[model samples]
Target: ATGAISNLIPKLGELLTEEFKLHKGVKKNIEDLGKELESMNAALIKIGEVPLDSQDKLWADEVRELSYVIEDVVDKFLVQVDGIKSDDNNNKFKGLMKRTTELLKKVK
Candidate 1:
């Protein structure tokens, strides 16, 4: 933690908007996931101020990792887009779309 709020918001929003055109469901999924994360984050603030048991710490760590991965997944899509214009099957846009769906499932 850099003691900073995550700075990925703008780019992530842009990527989701631009890249998720074909699979509109993915955008909604991500939004739902994001909303849930927001609630988790609020609870996490309490976790921070209080002493934690092993289970509490473990669960907090897990949630933090999930949040990080959710952001990283978006960045990975940008890299995937630039490096590989098209998958072997030729549906390049679907890569990010597909990736989001997989993460969306995991998030749920």
Candidate 2:
């Protein structure tokens, strides 16, 4: 029993590491996306001052491209998170992953 308990620690550690990495990646992606959206909103405000005909199509295209990239990152993160195994004692991990995936779909 002692040996089994000892082995469990490393397994738990591995799971914890995976969870930490996924959470950090999600947080970073959200921060980067927030900054990108803020920048796009500011640009749009500036563009509003210009004549509609004088507006830059390239800026709109860039915003769309960035949005797509963010969506892709979110999808990939959700996939990674969904691969985590569920534990009876730690069922919250599965719930969290499911919720995150749902949130990503909502965003898309």
Candidate 3:
């Protein structure tokens, strides 16, 4: 009944839409993660609603762990991205954006 991934869906949305004005590549990275998380969240709901099989339980456990990682990754991005502040005169923002995308792509 916990909503770990459930809550993150929109929080990620805020990061994409309202928070840092992310580069297009970074937005795609987060968007891809968000979309995948939604389906994982849906699967978690299904597992909870039904009597999970042994493998269902196993898979759910993996998803639970992965979801937590996703949460951490998002938080780090928020903090690091916020700290970077401006995209005007340096490639720091660009560097973070590339690294962010790289880390996120590896999350799957």
Candidate 4:
């Protein structure tokens, strides 16, 4: 994870945390996302620290996919909360739900 991909976890965490604390109709649990994010972050830290040649391709690919899914889960949560204000056209709920399940199902 680099830059926006890295910062998004904390950004969404804080944003949704506040929304959950102060707003209405945001009932989803974010803690599991946080924990899995940390688990993957630890893996990403390892990937960055290890020598390029010694890095495991499996973990690298895993992190890449997980990174995409995390951002997407946040995206879905945003859409679920804000409805049309978040994005009027691209509310990919069913696919998003399945991808979310896939992301959460896999261990880091």
Report lDDT per candidate.
Answer: 0.76, 0.79, 0.78, 0.72
Give the C-alpha miss distance for residue 44 in model 2, angstroms. 0.9
**Poorest stretch of ten by lDDT in candidate 3:** 83-92
- Tens digits of lDDT, candidate 3, 1-108: 665778979887997785465577698998998898789778767767764478877886787888789889989999987766754545566877999799899889
TM-score of 3: 0.53
User: Which residue pairs collide, candidate 1?
Assistant: none
Q: Order candidates by lDDT, high to low.
A: 2, 3, 1, 4
What is the Å distance of residue 26 in model 4 from its true position?
Answer: 7.4
Better of 2 and 4 by lDDT: 2
Per-prediction RMSD in angstroms?
20.3, 12.5, 20.3, 21.7
User: What would the TM-scores of all predictions be?
Assistant: 0.45, 0.52, 0.53, 0.42
User: What are the runs in model 4 whose C-alpha is more than 4 Å off?
Assistant: 1-28, 52-55, 84-108
> Number of clashes in model 2?
0
Query: How good is model 4 by TM-score?
Result: 0.42
Better of 3 and 4 by TM-score: 3
Which runs of model 3 end up more than 4 angstroms from their true locations?
Answer: 1-22, 86-108
The residue-by-residue lDDT of candidate 1 on 1-108, one tens digit each, is: 843336667777887787678468776877898899789879778767874578977986887788688889878967987766555655655786898699789987
Q: Which parts of model 1 have CA positions greater than 4 angstroms off?
A: 1-23, 80-108
